[PDB]
Design an enzyme around this catalytic site. Sequence first.
Site, PDB file in Angstrom:
ATOM      1  N   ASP A   1       0.853  -1.171   0.000  1.00  0.00           N
ATOM      2  CA  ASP A   1       0.000   0.000   0.000  1.00  0.00           C
ATOM      3  C   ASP A   1       0.898   1.232   0.000  1.00  0.00           C
ATOM      4  OD1 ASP A   1      -2.176   1.968   0.959  1.00  0.00           O
ATOM      5  OD2 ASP A   1      -3.254   0.089   0.961  1.00  0.00           O
TER       6      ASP A   1
ATOM      7  N   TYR B   1       7.257  -0.596  -4.431  1.00  0.00           N
ATOM      8  CA  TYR B   1       6.756  -1.207  -5.654  1.00  0.00           C
ATOM      9  C   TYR B   1       7.594  -2.380  -6.164  1.00  0.00           C
ATOM     10  CZ  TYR B   1       2.932   2.023  -6.923  1.00  0.00           C
ATOM     11  OH  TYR B   1       1.732   2.710  -6.990  1.00  0.00           O
TER      12      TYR B   1
ATOM     13  N   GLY C   1      -6.996   2.075  -4.696  1.00  0.00           N
ATOM     14  CA  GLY C   1      -7.874   3.127  -5.156  1.00  0.00           C
ATOM     15  C   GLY C   1      -8.926   3.554  -4.151  1.00  0.00           C
TER      16      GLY C   1
ATOM     17  N   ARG D   1     -20.347   3.759  -8.790  1.00  0.00           N
ATOM     18  CA  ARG D   1     -19.017   3.354  -9.225  1.00  0.00           C
ATOM     19  C   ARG D   1     -18.416   4.273 -10.289  1.00  0.00           C
ATOM     20  NH1 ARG D   1     -22.413  -1.154  -8.904  1.00  0.00           N
ATOM     21  NH2 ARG D   1     -21.802  -2.937  -7.614  1.00  0.00           N
TER      22      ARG D   1
ATOM     23  N   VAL E   1      -9.526  -5.220  -9.527  1.00  0.00           N
ATOM     24  CA  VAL E   1     -10.725  -5.071  -8.722  1.00  0.00           C
ATOM     25  C   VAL E   1     -11.202  -3.614  -8.684  1.00  0.00           C
ATOM     26  CG1 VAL E   1     -11.654  -5.369  -6.413  1.00  0.00           C
ATOM     27  CG2 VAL E   1      -9.981  -7.020  -7.312  1.00  0.00           C
TER      28      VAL E   1
ATOM     29  N   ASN F   1     -12.501   0.022  -9.128  1.00  0.00           N
ATOM     30  CA  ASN F   1     -13.613   0.471  -9.959  1.00  0.00           C
ATOM     31  C   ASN F   1     -13.343   1.793 -10.676  1.00  0.00           C
ATOM     32  OD1 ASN F   1     -15.835  -1.346 -10.065  1.00  0.00           O
ATOM     33  ND2 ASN F   1     -16.220  -0.979  -7.874  1.00  0.00           N
TER      34      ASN F   1
ATOM     35  N   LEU G   1     -12.603  -8.489 -11.648  1.00  0.00           N
ATOM     36  CA  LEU G   1     -13.630  -9.035 -10.791  1.00  0.00           C
ATOM     37  C   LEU G   1     -14.972  -8.421 -11.138  1.00  0.00           C
ATOM     38  CD1 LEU G   1     -14.802 -10.475  -8.237  1.00  0.00           C
ATOM     39  CD2 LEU G   1     -14.246  -8.357  -6.952  1.00  0.00           C
TER      40      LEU G   1
ATOM     41  N   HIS H   1     -19.793  -4.801 -14.637  1.00  0.00           N
ATOM     42  CA  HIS H   1     -20.040  -4.790 -13.203  1.00  0.00           C
ATOM     43  C   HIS H   1     -20.423  -3.351 -12.835  1.00  0.00           C
ATOM     44  CE1 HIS H   1     -19.824  -5.706  -8.966  1.00  0.00           C
ATOM     45  NE2 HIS H   1     -18.984  -4.701  -8.794  1.00  0.00           N
TER      46      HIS H   1
HETATM   47  N1  LIG Z   1     -14.779  -5.185  -9.065  1.00  0.00           N
HETATM   48  C1  LIG Z   1     -15.575  -5.305  -7.989  1.00  0.00           C
HETATM   49  O1  LIG Z   1     -16.606  -6.232  -7.979  1.00  0.00           O
HETATM   50  C2  LIG Z   1     -15.428  -4.501  -6.731  1.00  0.00           C
HETATM   51  C3  LIG Z   1     -16.021  -4.943  -5.548  1.00  0.00           C
HETATM   52  C4  LIG Z   1     -15.785  -4.199  -4.387  1.00  0.00           C
HETATM   53  C5  LIG Z   1     -14.889  -3.151  -4.560  1.00  0.00           C
HETATM   54  N2  LIG Z   1     -14.390  -2.613  -5.629  1.00  0.00           N
HETATM   55  C6  LIG Z   1     -13.405  -1.550  -5.662  1.00  0.00           C
HETATM   56  O2  LIG Z   1     -12.207  -2.056  -5.087  1.00  0.00           O
HETATM   57  C7  LIG Z   1     -11.445  -0.953  -4.637  1.00  0.00           C
HETATM   58  C8  LIG Z   1     -10.918  -1.245  -3.240  1.00  0.00           C
HETATM   59  O3  LIG Z   1     -11.953  -1.361  -2.287  1.00  0.00           O
HETATM   60  P1  LIG Z   1     -11.585  -1.520  -0.733  1.00  0.00           P
HETATM   61  O4  LIG Z   1     -12.857  -1.753  -0.003  1.00  0.00           O
HETATM   62  O5  LIG Z   1     -10.495  -2.488  -0.514  1.00  0.00           O
HETATM   63  O6  LIG Z   1     -11.087   0.007  -0.482  1.00  0.00           O
HETATM   64  P2  LIG Z   1     -10.054   0.553   0.615  1.00  0.00           P
HETATM   65  O7  LIG Z   1     -10.207   2.034   0.577  1.00  0.00           O
HETATM   66  O8  LIG Z   1     -10.282  -0.113   1.956  1.00  0.00           O
HETATM   67  O9  LIG Z   1      -8.617   0.115   0.142  1.00  0.00           O
HETATM   68  C9  LIG Z   1      -7.974   0.633  -1.007  1.00  0.00           C
HETATM   69  C10 LIG Z   1      -6.489   0.840  -0.673  1.00  0.00           C
HETATM   70  O10 LIG Z   1      -5.793   1.309  -1.820  1.00  0.00           O
HETATM   71  C11 LIG Z   1      -4.701   2.047  -1.328  1.00  0.00           C
HETATM   72  N3  LIG Z   1      -4.009   2.753  -2.421  1.00  0.00           N
HETATM   73  C12 LIG Z   1      -4.247   3.975  -3.011  1.00  0.00           C
HETATM   74  N4  LIG Z   1      -3.315   4.141  -3.975  1.00  0.00           N
HETATM   75  C13 LIG Z   1      -2.491   3.057  -4.026  1.00  0.00           C
HETATM   76  C14 LIG Z   1      -1.395   2.685  -4.803  1.00  0.00           C
HETATM   77  N5  LIG Z   1      -0.870   3.478  -5.735  1.00  0.00           N
HETATM   78  N6  LIG Z   1      -0.794   1.466  -4.576  1.00  0.00           N
HETATM   79  C15 LIG Z   1      -1.247   0.629  -3.588  1.00  0.00           C
HETATM   80  N7  LIG Z   1      -2.322   0.996  -2.818  1.00  0.00           N
HETATM   81  C16 LIG Z   1      -2.932   2.182  -3.045  1.00  0.00           C
HETATM   82  C17 LIG Z   1      -5.309   2.906  -0.244  1.00  0.00           C
HETATM   83  O11 LIG Z   1      -4.349   3.499   0.604  1.00  0.00           O
HETATM   84  C18 LIG Z   1      -6.228   1.890   0.428  1.00  0.00           C
HETATM   85  O12 LIG Z   1      -5.628   1.259   1.531  1.00  0.00           O
HETATM   86  C19 LIG Z   1     -12.387   0.263  -4.772  1.00  0.00           C
HETATM   87  O13 LIG Z   1     -12.096   0.977  -5.973  1.00  0.00           O
HETATM   88  C20 LIG Z   1     -13.770  -0.337  -4.874  1.00  0.00           C
HETATM   89  O14 LIG Z   1     -14.715   0.411  -5.600  1.00  0.00           O
HETATM   90  C21 LIG Z   1     -14.608  -3.385  -6.728  1.00  0.00           C
HETATM   91  O1  LIG Z   2     -20.220  -4.813  -5.920  1.00  0.00           O
HETATM   92  C1  LIG Z   2     -19.551  -4.542  -4.942  1.00  0.00           C
HETATM   93  O2  LIG Z   2     -19.487  -5.205  -3.927  1.00  0.00           O
HETATM   94  C2  LIG Z   2     -18.779  -3.316  -4.854  1.00  0.00           C
HETATM   95  N1  LIG Z   2     -18.540  -2.705  -3.728  1.00  0.00           N
HETATM   96  O3  LIG Z   2     -17.786  -1.564  -3.999  1.00  0.00           O
HETATM   97  N2  LIG Z   2     -17.543  -1.484  -5.367  1.00  0.00           N
HETATM   98  C3  LIG Z   2     -18.144  -2.525  -5.921  1.00  0.00           C
HETATM   99  O4  LIG Z   2     -18.168  -2.843  -7.173  1.00  0.00           O
END
Ligand SMILES: NC(=O)c1ccc[n+]([C@@H]2O[C@H](COP(=O)([O-])OP(=O)(O)OC[C@H]3O[C@@H](n4cnc5c(N)ncnc54)[C@H](O)[C@@H]3O)[C@@H](O)[C@H]2O)c1
Ligand SMILES: O=C(O)c1nonc1O
Lengths: 315, 315, 315, 315
Positions: D34, D66, D80, D94, D124, D126, D149, D181
């Site tokens: 992170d 990194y 993110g 999203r 993952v 968004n 995902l 998604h």
């Molecule tokens: N595709 C899907 O089905 C889906 C599902 C849930 C979440 N999401 C997305 O997943 C992402 C993460 O969610 P989360 O609940 O873990 O959020 P979170 O805020 O708890 O964790 C994200 C982490 O990313 C870190 N970060 C920022 N820039 C970075 C970098 N350059 N390198 C490494 N780390 C970095 C932050 O400091 C933070 O700890 C969000 O964008 C959310 O919308 C997607």
């Molecule tokens: O679908 C989900 O769970 C989701 N939660 O945060 N971003 C997402 O895509």
Amino acid sequence: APKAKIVLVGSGMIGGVMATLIVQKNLGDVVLFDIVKNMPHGKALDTSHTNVMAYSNCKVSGSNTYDDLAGADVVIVTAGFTKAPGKSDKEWNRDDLLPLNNKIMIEIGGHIKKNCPNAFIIVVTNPVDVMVQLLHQHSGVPKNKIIGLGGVLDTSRLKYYISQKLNVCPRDVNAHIVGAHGNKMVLLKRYITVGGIPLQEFINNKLISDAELEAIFDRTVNTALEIVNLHASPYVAPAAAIIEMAESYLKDLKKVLICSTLLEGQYGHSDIFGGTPVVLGANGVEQVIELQLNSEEKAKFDEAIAETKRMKALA
Amino acid sequence: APKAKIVLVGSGMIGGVMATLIVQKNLGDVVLFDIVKNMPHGKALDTSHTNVMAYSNCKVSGSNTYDDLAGADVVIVTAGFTKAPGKSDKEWNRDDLLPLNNKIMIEIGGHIKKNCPNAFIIVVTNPVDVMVQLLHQHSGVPKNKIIGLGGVLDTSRLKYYISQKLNVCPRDVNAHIVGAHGNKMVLLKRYITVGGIPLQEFINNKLISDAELEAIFDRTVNTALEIVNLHASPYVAPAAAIIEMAESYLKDLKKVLICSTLLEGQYGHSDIFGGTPVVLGANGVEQVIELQLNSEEKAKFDEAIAETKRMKALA
Amino acid sequence: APKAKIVLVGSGMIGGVMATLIVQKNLGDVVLFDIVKNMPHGKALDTSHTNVMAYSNCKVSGSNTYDDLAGADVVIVTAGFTKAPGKSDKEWNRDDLLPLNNKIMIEIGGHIKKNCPNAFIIVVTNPVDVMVQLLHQHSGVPKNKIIGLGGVLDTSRLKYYISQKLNVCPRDVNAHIVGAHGNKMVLLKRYITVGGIPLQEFINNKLISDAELEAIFDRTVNTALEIVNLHASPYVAPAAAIIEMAESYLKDLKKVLICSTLLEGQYGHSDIFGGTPVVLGANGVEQVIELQLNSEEKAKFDEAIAETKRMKALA
Amino acid sequence: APKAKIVLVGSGMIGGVMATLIVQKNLGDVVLFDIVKNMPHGKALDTSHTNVMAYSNCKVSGSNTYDDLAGADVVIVTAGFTKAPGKSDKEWNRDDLLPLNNKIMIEIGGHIKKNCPNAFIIVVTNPVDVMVQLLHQHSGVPKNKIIGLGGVLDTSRLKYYISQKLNVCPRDVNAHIVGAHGNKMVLLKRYITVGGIPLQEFINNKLISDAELEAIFDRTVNTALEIVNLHASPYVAPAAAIIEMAESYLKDLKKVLICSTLLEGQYGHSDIFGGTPVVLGANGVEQVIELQLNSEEKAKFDEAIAETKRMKALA
Ligand SMILES: NC(=O)c1ccc[n+]([C@@H]2O[C@H](COP(=O)([O-])OP(=O)(O)OC[C@H]3O[C@@H](n4cnc5c(N)ncnc54)[C@H](O)[C@@H]3O)[C@@H](O)[C@H]2O)c1
Ligand SMILES: O=C(O)c1nonc1O
Ligand SMILES: NC(=O)c1ccc[n+]([C@@H]2O[C@H](COP(=O)([O-])OP(=O)(O)OC[C@H]3O[C@@H](n4cnc5c(N)ncnc54)[C@H](O)[C@@H]3O)[C@@H](O)[C@H]2O)c1
Ligand SMILES: NC(=O)c1ccc[n+]([C@@H]2O[C@H](COP(=O)([O-])OP(=O)(O)OC[C@H]3O[C@@H](n4cnc5c(N)ncnc54)[C@H](O)[C@@H]3O)[C@@H](O)[C@H]2O)c1
Ligand SMILES: NC(=O)c1ccc[n+]([C@@H]2O[C@H](COP(=O)([O-])OP(=O)(O)OC[C@H]3O[C@@H](n4cnc5c(N)ncnc54)[C@H](O)[C@@H]3O)[C@@H](O)[C@H]2O)c1
Ligand SMILES: O=C(O)c1nonc1O
Ligand SMILES: O=C(O)c1nonc1O
Ligand SMILES: O=C(O)c1nonc1O
């Protein structure tokens, strides 16, 4: 047949990981109970979907209603505070949680007594060796039906740190930490083994030194504080330790696990809870194992119990 | 990624249970190799369907062709006889398998050397401490890449029998049996623990007596013979023990497991294989652990090694 | 809490693998019951040691005493013959086991009725759709508490064979085989899916052809016979299929599994057992699912039931 | 042999649960990377102790560097933001994460390209269908080595909700959600099965109605939003879904799982990523499965892809 019902009284950081692990292991239906509105329902919903990925069939529901304790087979109490207001992370000390958490234990005890007097109870809330006895007194459950988390978690750390130096499977390291879960926890050097072999053999062979072990002991005692300063009050390992305990009960595994339990003469102590190896099976605490401590080890044990006794007087 | 290939050289009773367990654990593709026609193909087909029930994806194929060893990651050798012609069940003795199995090991060794010199080899065929060295010599594999089954199986029995008396989780009993897998196996009373606690504490507390332990020792040594007379040469526990060993290698678990391995000065012995705790990981035998045996224990160790040495001279 | 007690009535090839799998999965205490002296005790002893390797805590005992059924939570009946005297392997046919196994089912039924009328019963002995009803009649257990093995095993084969061609996870293939477990088993082409997708999509894409599927159907029907001629009456996959069924009951998984069950109007049939998807949970057969078969599928179903009915008249 | 190295780029809520699950399943060594100081080291330490309770042997380390990507076998990108500044929970969408997360993907892509061009990548962050293609472009990895995902998580919800009404094992419900998604995810009613049976059979039998299904569809689409308003952006089920995907790759399971992948003509679309069933094994995306959608389903698919395309133009 029928599935066990596991009520998590407290749905915070530890509650969340416990619900996840219960679903992974298909251990039983879960209630995430908390005083906070909405939060437990959201965690429950999120967690419930993992039944698909896990090949499990456990209901996960949120609750703000104490009566959901009715029907509980296992009650895990994490409800309470993790830090005292005004304290810096550097000054974090479990003792300072006493005045914050004592009333919470009394309240939960009454609800347990009314709703699920036959449930097996695991107390986690700190200071745990004080809180567990408080909950015992107020819930009225039998002495074989309530334990506190401590030793499984403390030894997980000691075992792991040693396994990292020796390059062996962490589970192959065995170790005992007794007395109380706090800064006076007793790390019993004499009771450490690696693959069932006395650690002293590895020390003799210069694979790990006495000095290295001393540093690992200090690291173990200070692990919670270390993690608090880097991130937060630990929750992943606590959760795993608790579920190992709960699972031993639920599946009648009869594992030997170090937990806080009512002492009735062991180590020269009665009328107080302290950490010692116990056997957990279908009948709860099936055996309390008393380590045959030498005089010097006993003195350390006494110092640990004295802290619990001191705070019990303050509670 | 890519899946490991595990070749079972010998598809009899132990081979069959091993293939079942490999599929249960999704450990890798399996070849059931044997000299007997048709049989391995039938067992392979039967076993292959369990991928559905097990949520696994392991090919299971039968073979009568030695070249199927090519590509093997792990080779488990059970090929050979279980009893000598003309002997009654009452007279069953592993030593009598020597003249029957020696040529089989030499033949398999040549095929291993040609086809999979980089494979990790587990030898099971009896008398195992003799056969394992024979296979080492003829396969040309490194000393860290070949072990014999013995201690994991012998201690499983000792650990289990004690756990039954003490009413604890069988895995919570730890114990060491060393030297050789046969009637002179060395049962080290001093190295038994229960939940990491010296067994002597439980003896002091009259939870298990010295006499009870002696009977358990005799039962352990005679277990194979007991099962041979009731049913057949044991295969379920041997299979499970072997797979525990193979899995530690495949998944780099670094478990401490007692196996037959090349001694190079440990216990005062060189140029021979004997049973001792080793650490099994991705690099094979990663560590040979030498127990700091006292004089009396060493004398027993010497007696065990003497049997292996005697038969090696006869092989 | 307390552990389930699982009595294996019949301790032969399937009994043995079932005991192994029960210990692997820590599902409950096991009794290996048989009429043969000594054999079950030897298999039980051998199997019991695997508790150590498996991290389990299941008693495994042998028995020649019917009263050991008392306390049973689950009873699995495999007792009986696998081939008829005088028949060649080439002429192996489940129907010929009828006169050999009918009396055995009646005898076991009486013992179940006396000792464990509340147990969940799984019948395996062939011809299974006839034997299961026979056992139902003589044990007096409720219709929701007794099923026969068939569909889980037959579809495991169909699912596996298709997964091998399509290079997908075997569990991702779903398929239905209904009616009876024998040469007239009904393979429902229309009810095959791959990752939840109609198999017809893969046929349209020329990933698997209609002709290939036909060969796989024939292979599925003839699998038992194939294995009998190569080796022996199959036992590894049968065992795994049975344990999947038993586990769904024990852990209240509510899996949809095709089993032989009492029909009360489904498919136009009553007063007979036949293979159909059912839901197995803590209440036994919780739901009987009736496939909405078309006219042609129903005609095949009728042909299967007719065989069961014919032999029931001969029993 | 040697253990896989799994680098979690992003150590927030999802990162944390993923590290826990990886240790539970002993899948490989873990790096919690992170940009935030100290936090990943604390989570890593906490999580590492669970090796003891889990019988695992996975290193868990924190990182702000990194270059720790070097040696990665699997890279999971969650880095993110979860919400846009100024938006209320009620307005969570999203799409609003686009301007916040685009630069982060570009930066991570360059590091992947330099350090682990041969790693399998799961995106993952968004809006995921946009971010995954962005990461593909900047990391330079092959099309078979990067997925996003979506579908596993979306269908987990649909499958679960249906299983709750029908009282069956959640895994026994199969369902497809494709396209993208987000709010235009395509819920394919025609591709729902229960125990391999068309859901329409259960609708015909009045076990679940069309109206009930419609409400479940709406609930599924809105699940993330629901959980955001009750608690937080979901993380437990996302984590489990991701690990199911990663595990299929690592263990060559060849599971059919719906993920965002590069389309090259499927559904009439090229040059864009979209959600569709794929087979994940040791070679990454081993097969892209194109559902034979009817005209009306395709129109819905097109609407979903149009959203991805619209934001790609804004990125
Ligand atoms: N595709 C899907 O089905 C889906 C599902 C849930 C979440 N999401 C997305 O997943 C992402 C993460 O969610 P989360 O609940 O873990 O959020 P979170 O805020 O708890 O964790 C994200 C982490 O990313 C870190 N970060 C920022 N820039 C970075 C970098 N350059 N390198 C490494 N780390 C970095 C932050 O400091 C933070 O700890 C969000 O964008 C959310 O919308 C997607
Ligand atoms: O679908 C989900 O769970 C989701 N939660 O945060 N971003 C997402 O895509
Ligand atoms: N025994 C041990 O080894 C050990 C280990 C770690 C933590 N702890 C202790 O465990 C406790 C929980 O830690 P956490 O990380 O989960 O904290 P947390 O703050 O994340 O969660 C505690 C939860 O308790 C809830 N709560 C307060 N009163 C309640 C009540 N009457 N009923 C139900 N819920 C109530 C809070 O709203 C909160 O959600 C703390 O006291 C901590 O010191 C003990
Ligand atoms: N080390 C131990 O702790 C231990 C434990 C149990 C058994 N054993 C030994 O393991 C061996 C196997 O026992 P089992 O119960 O599986 O016996 P088994 O008779 O069921 O199987 C042995 C198989 O080896 C086959 N075989 C013979 N020559 C072969 C060759 N050249 N290549 C491949 N296969 C060949 C036979 O056809 C037979 O199928 C025996 O020697 C037994 O004494 C050792
Ligand atoms: N339903 C199915 O899909 C299916 C699948 C495979 C096998 N089968 C049948 O299962 C049965 C068992 O097969 P197996 O391979 O285990 O055969 P097996 O011959 O190895 O074992 C059967 C055992 O039953 C014992 N027995 C005989 N009478 C008994 C009694 N009164 N009480 C207890 N035990 C008794 C025998 O001594 C023997 O040990 C056979 O009838 C076979 O046709 C059914
Ligand atoms: O030891 C711990 O992990 C701990 N963390 O917060 N309170 C505790 O006791
Ligand atoms: O110890 C055993 O189980 C054994 N059985 O057959 N040979 C052996 O060594
Ligand atoms: O189908 C089988 O496996 C079978 N084997 O023996 N009898 C049977 O029914």
